[PDB]
């Protein structure tokens, strides 16, 4: 199944780049990367499949 099916190569640019951030560097995850300083905090209110929240 050339260029079809389900089993697809991830040998393009993989964006899963686990880089620690505590300076003004944009992220690489859900949502469009705007300006942000990363304040690492502990929370419990995330559950199920809830990574992001809006106001």
């Amino acid at each position: 199944g050339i260029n079809s099916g389900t089993t697809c190569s991830n040998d393009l640019l993989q964006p899963n780049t686990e880089v620690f951030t505590d300076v003004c560097v944009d992220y690489d995850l859900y949502g469009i990367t705007g300006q942000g300083i990363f304040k690492e905090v502990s929370a419990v209110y995330y559950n199920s499949w809830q990574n992001l929240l809006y106001d």
């Binding site: 300006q35 300083i37 304040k39 106001d55």
Partner: protein
Amino acid sequence: TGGSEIRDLLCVQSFNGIKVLPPILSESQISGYTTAATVAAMFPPWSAAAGIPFS
């Protein structure tokens, strides 16, 4: 400038561009001016009371 209160609408207004400039006169000196006018009305010489005692 860093820390807590991620719901901070006044500075994300400033981060988006709109800045509420402070007025060019502080309220301390304006309140002192109003106090000075009131005690001028209450004490001799009564400049704010046309030279007449309050009672």
